Amino acid sequence: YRARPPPRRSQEPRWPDPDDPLTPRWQLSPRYAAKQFARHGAASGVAAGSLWPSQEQLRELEAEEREWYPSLAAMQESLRVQQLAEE
Amino acid sequence: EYPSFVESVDEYHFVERLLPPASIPRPPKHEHYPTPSGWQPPRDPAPSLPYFVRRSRMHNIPVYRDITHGNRQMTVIRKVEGDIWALQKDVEDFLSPLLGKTPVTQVNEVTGTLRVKGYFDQQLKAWLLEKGF
Amino acid sequence: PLHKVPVGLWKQLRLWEGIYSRLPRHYLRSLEEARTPTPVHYRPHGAKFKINPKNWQRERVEDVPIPVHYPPESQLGLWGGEGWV
Amino acid sequence: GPRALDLLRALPRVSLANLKPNPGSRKPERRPRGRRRGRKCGRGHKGERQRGTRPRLGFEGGQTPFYLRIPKYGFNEGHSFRHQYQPLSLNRLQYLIDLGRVDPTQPIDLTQLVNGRGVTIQPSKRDYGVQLVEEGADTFKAKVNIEVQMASELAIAAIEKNGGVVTTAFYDPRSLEILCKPVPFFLRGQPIPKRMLPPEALVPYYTDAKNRGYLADPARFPEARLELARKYGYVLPDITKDELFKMLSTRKDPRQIFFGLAPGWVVNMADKKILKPTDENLLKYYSS
Amino acid sequence: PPVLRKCELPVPAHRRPVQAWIESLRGYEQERVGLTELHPDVFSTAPRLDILHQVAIWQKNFKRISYAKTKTRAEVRGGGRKPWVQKGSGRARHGSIRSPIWRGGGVAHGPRGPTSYYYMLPMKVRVQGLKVALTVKLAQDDLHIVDSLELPTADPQYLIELARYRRWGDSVLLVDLEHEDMPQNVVAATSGLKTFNLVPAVGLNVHSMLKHQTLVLTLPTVAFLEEKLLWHNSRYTPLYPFRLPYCDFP
Amino acid sequence: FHVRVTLPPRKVVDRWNEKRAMFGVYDNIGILGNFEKHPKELIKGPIWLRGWKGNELQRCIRKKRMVGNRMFIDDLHNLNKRISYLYKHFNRHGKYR
Amino acid sequence: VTYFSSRKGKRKTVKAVIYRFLRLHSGLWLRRKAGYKKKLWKKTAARKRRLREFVFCNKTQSKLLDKMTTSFWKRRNWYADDPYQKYQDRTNLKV
RNA sequence: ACCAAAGCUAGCUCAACAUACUAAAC
């Protein structure tokens, strides 16, 4: 007998059907398209401008960072106040 | 409202440094042996011994120590090709004056492995280095 | 054997097929979306992160709406979006 | 050499009909059948043990258990928030350099170490990078531009004696994951994020010149080097007169993760391209 | 014209490569056409029948999924109530009528659902098993190197008579380099035979090598197998799966 | 203990059919093929068992987690009851504790 | 002890032992003496020192705690300024 | 020697795919 064709992983980008309700959610999430671009990029067909955050996303990121990450000068001033208090 | 981007190939030589090698690089040739880390390559020709202790994939001597039951200490010499009984005889002749008696040994011939009863890893490593393996 | 489509999508499939498909698209899109109603009985927290008073670490907090029951007499009046807790 | 290959000539063909595992590799399972292994089948007489209803492990038959009578004390209290640093001995570093896993001609970083398989960083286990110890400081003869997160005075002195550069930088867990596994991050499709600043607990460590902190004042580095040299009794070499001074003095921006790359770039490895942002808000956010 | 093949990989200084004949599948009598050199770390390693047995058992078992399932006493249809009272009846006490004691009752332990007997031997163990299979096939005079796997005709009886003349045995496994690069002559000659099986290089396995009495390898297949098998002797542990981009690995 | 009185027809099994001749052909697909596809991909069977192995409790847990939303009513009830029984037996019953 | 969890099917660990015990990497378990904070005015300075001193556990209790803890608590931890880092290993144990 | 004994089939079980899911008769 002759062997069957070997199982080969396709290197072409694969996009699931967004209108089929049987497709999973992780295959429609934006991270799926981002990873498809990272894998192929050219043959993927993903707008490279979408990899960066949008305006509202940038604003929310800046708010989060300014609320949960103090500046180096402010942190040094807080540390100086604390060491002065201990002294 | 997609932001504009620039596509460049100039800074892609930095990405080559972030790719780990899938193989192990051969040790560089030094002007003096042994190296400061104590490493030493084998001799250029093969010795006339009827056995060959092949180096590990990291270019180290395959002499390890093993513990069993929390109190049984053994020393394992691996990667032996040839008359393993000659290597066993040489090991017993080398370890007899150190202990005053013939050391207990097991010879796995189908595996090419020697197993001495006790911790003699450093001494066996130095002995194999003197023998040029 | 197993069902090809999960049970949670059966109502969606019936809404997609049959006479439910011939309904107006604006009505259909108004019915599909399930917006979170305003908190009436539970009091939500403002920020998405909070510092634990015991752990002194930042943790992501979320708001879970408390189930409220609307008796059939509430559909004849205007209770303000509340009901029986 | 392998006389077994010559012995295999007289032996018949090796097939699936003559295959035996190693003697002792398979301990045969024993079933409750027969006169010996039947008749209560290794369970004993009545009680809870034969019927399979004995209490849990810590239970001692109603007596207050040992694992509950001991008072609570802080031993692992806040253990999931203690910063961990994988140790790297100068002995191991010299071993890697001598075996050729890492090259002293280039700036050595955590990415280079994990590529050379010198250290393994598990950032999900609260690991915060690599610390330098001095277990092999006596026989260290390598001149490298090392980049660690913590270092001991003895290790820094042993490196300066050979004429290297030690620097302690900070990496929040995300940047540590990215620095340890860059290719799995480049295959993710996300821009290179910024390097978060160290918290207030580590700021005095990274703004100190004795620790060679990456946020420390570069004007106090020669003074600290001279103090270390005069303390450990070795002459401080003229580092600026070295042929590899550029490689020895190359630095990373406190917001930078890799060498040469910049926060906000997308590495498309399929087309070998680097997409850089051009938006003003994007650039301000990525350079802040 | 003598066709000679040299080892394209570094051979250790203490070991010499093993030489083998290169036959041709075109003529009946032309059995000695060239000379090939095979790496000793691939075709002359130590014969490890235990590793052979391990890899064979793995190949047989790791794909198995037993679709055997019996109904316990909880899945049988009836038996929801006591058949008789606990006392007074004079007979034995019972609960459900679907107990494993009863006739139409459930099974006490039995097989439970689809069971997957799945496990993965270490990659170096599987590679060493392949090496040992090739080495024993060479050492037992059951490995034959051919060139280009060319055939004059598509007659399977031609291959039958050729194997009977060359005393290859009952079963022959011809390994080619690629699947689409297989000549239609040998394809049609092997599609009608049972004991003569044609497989590509990525389809070589310990189970098939032990099932077929004779192995046939072409020169490009030998080179490919040597290159694929010798890579694991001096490789690192995978930081991430080898399907991802590495420095020197595809 | 009454044994059959006639000999059964000898099953003529050919060990050289297609399946027996090509069995386990691509087991080394990753090793001999520049690893892209794990031998997991050759496993044919239920979805919750392709390249996975566990005891009965883990099997039931994984089945309910993966394909539980498509099972029938009686099948899902029997699966929940089996999960409960296996939980109680494995966490409260036994000898070695 | 939950030998097989219901969500993941894994083995769980009891939190009391991690709250009142400390495992060194060499296999030893460290604990506090019971009653070192109760009625200190009624006890002698020597007894109070005995209560304040740390203590080890024997083989049976150590194996019990190993059974009650998972493998996450038996790992090698490299903490910054760990007081027990010098005790994480064992030296000169001639068994 | 009675009572009796032996068949190999009816069919079931577990999965995969699947039109997309209250069969036919009304």
Ligand SMILES: [Mg+2]
């Ligand atoms: Mg061991």
Ligand SMILES: [Mg+2]
């Ligand atoms: Mg037993």
Ligand SMILES: [Mg+2]
């Ligand atoms: Mg058993």
Ligand SMILES: [Mg+2]
């Ligand atoms: Mg008995």
Ligand SMILES: [Mg+2]
């Ligand atoms: Mg009895």
Ligand SMILES: [Mg+2]
């Ligand atoms: Mg008794």
Ligand SMILES: [Mg+2]
């Ligand atoms: Mg009793």
Ligand SMILES: [Mg+2]
């Ligand atoms: Mg009894």
Ligand SMILES: [Mg+2]
């Ligand atoms: Mg009591």
Ligand SMILES: [Mg+2]
């Ligand atoms: Mg670690």
Ligand SMILES: [Mg+2]
């Ligand atoms: Mg019932």
Ligand SMILES: [Mg+2]
């Ligand atoms: Mg009832």
Ligand SMILES: [Mg+2]
């Ligand atoms: Mg009952």
Ligand SMILES: [Mg+2]
């Ligand atoms: Mg039944």
